[PDB]
């Protein structure tokens with residue numbers, strides 16, 4: 001299938017409201033195709049702490 | 051010897067379209083940062099998918 | 101009369117002269133959040149939240165059908181209904197059960213969609229949402245993750 | 250028998266009212282064309298009174314300047330704290346304004 | 358900065374930093390670490406010291 | 412053909428109309444015309460410079476209405492003495 | 508037989524006024540809105556806050 005590594009800090013960009021758009025870019029790649037594989041790793045970089 | 055031939059080209063800007071008016075383009079547009087741009091289309095377009 | 105405090109108006113460069121108040125500028129994100137999909141989650145499909153279904157339907161859907169029943173008695177329906185609790189009891193399910201068993205213009209609204217970068221869009225978008233649901237006067241209005249805004 | 254004097258008075262009423270109202274909207278819109286003399290200003294706020302004729306204004310995106318009045322813009326009114334309208338070329342003060350800021354003071 | 362007599366290096370409230378000269382008028386003990394300074398536009402040179410905030 | 416140093420004698424009215432018309436032409440870079448006399452290659456005296464109306468699109472030759480010229484100079488035909496439009500002017504009123 | 512012809516000629520007296528006032532409407536309106544088309548063909552229409 002289409003396998004996608006995800007560096008968590010590819011969401012952590014500098015400017016205001018851009019990693020949100022990075023999630024948008026992710027879902028744009030996702031809904032182009034079929035059976036694709038997003039692989040997260042190190043989601044503490046993304047974070048689970050409020 | 052092909053340089054000066056390409057010198058009358060143009061620095062024309064890519065954009066992103068806000069809406070379409072009815073019965074006419076009358077398109078409103080933003081590029082990135084400046085403003086929200088009221089434009090025409092050129093005559094040799096496919097006026098459907100703008 | 102088209103002017104008020106807080107107006108995006110479209111202004112010439114060289115004159116700096118006002119020409120339009122941006123009158124017909126409903127964006128793709130503005131019109132995508134409107135609901136034309138009409139989900140179908142049944143009340144019987146949800147179990148055990150009996151009195152919460154009571155409060156929900158009998159205090160939102162009865163203003164949709166009986167305003168005069170508040171007027172025959174001389175009271176006034178509440179404005180503002182809030183859900184909260186643990187993130188597994190089913191919260192979005194109740195808004196979807198509203199969308200199913202009522203037809204009075206269900207309007208979703210997602211939270212971080214209102215987080216803007218082109219600045220000035222989300223407030224305009226909320227005003228567009230209430231204007232649009234005002235156009236279909238009984239307004240079923242839902243927002244998830246209100247804490248995110 | 251002389252209703253052509255009222256077909257002339259009615260022509261006066263209809264044609265003159267319509268052409269006069271079209272040329273009246275054209276008078277006010279020729280004045281809107283005359284507003285291509287009233288071509289833009291800037292707005293800033295007086296930050297201090299530099300000298301009796303000078304003021305430091307606040308371009309709301311940025312820098313700070315030295316200005317004057319038009320001629321008779323009441324230099325005692327332009328206290329530090331007022332908002333003024335600034336000229337486009339000369340950049341000096343054109344017209345005072347009210348307003349102030351965040352409605353967390355206002356909504357309470 | 359002044360590299361020598363009357364040749365400045367000047368920051369602005371446009372943010373950036375420039376390299377101009379200053380006049381033959383201004384006293385050299387008005388800029389002694391700094392000042393709120395008055396700058397021209399085309400010539401863009403140091404003219405005057407604004408009154409500090411105090 | 413051959414070239415020899417061209418000289419622009421100015422009418423001082425042209426100096427006044429340039430300063431006034433660009434002064435009114437506040438930042439918006441007005442267009443006007445130059446109306447003069449063909450003496451030779453190496454000199455020109457301009458005798459008249461009048462005003463042209465403000466156009467907010469873009470400073471162009473297509474804003475030059477020739478029937479505006481016809482009507483204005485038609486009024487100027489018996490008024491004094493008309494000549495050829497020999498040029499034009501635009502403005503940059505803040506910088507050099 | 509004399510006042511009716513006076514009103515007949517006064518109809519043309521008012522029709523000349525119709526011609527000139529419709530000129531002050533229409534020919535001036537062409538001036539106004541040609542200037543306003545000259546303001547309606549710009550780079551943006553810059554969004555702002557009133």
Ligand SMILES: Nc1ncnc2c1ncn2[C@@H]1O[C@H](COP(=O)(O)OP(=O)(O)OP(O)(O)=S)[C@@H](O)[C@H]1O
Nearest residue numbers: 145146147148149185186187188189190191192193
């Ligand atoms: N009464 C119920 N009957 C059937 N499934 C239920 C019921 N209550 C909850 N669920 C299930 O719980 C989930 C729905 O809860 P949620 O989708 O988390 O609602 P919610 O709005 O997301 O809550 P949070 O705080 O936002 S995560 C789905 O898996 C449902 O199938």
Ligand SMILES: [Zn+2]
Nearest residue numbers: 440501502503
């Ligand atoms: Zn110029």
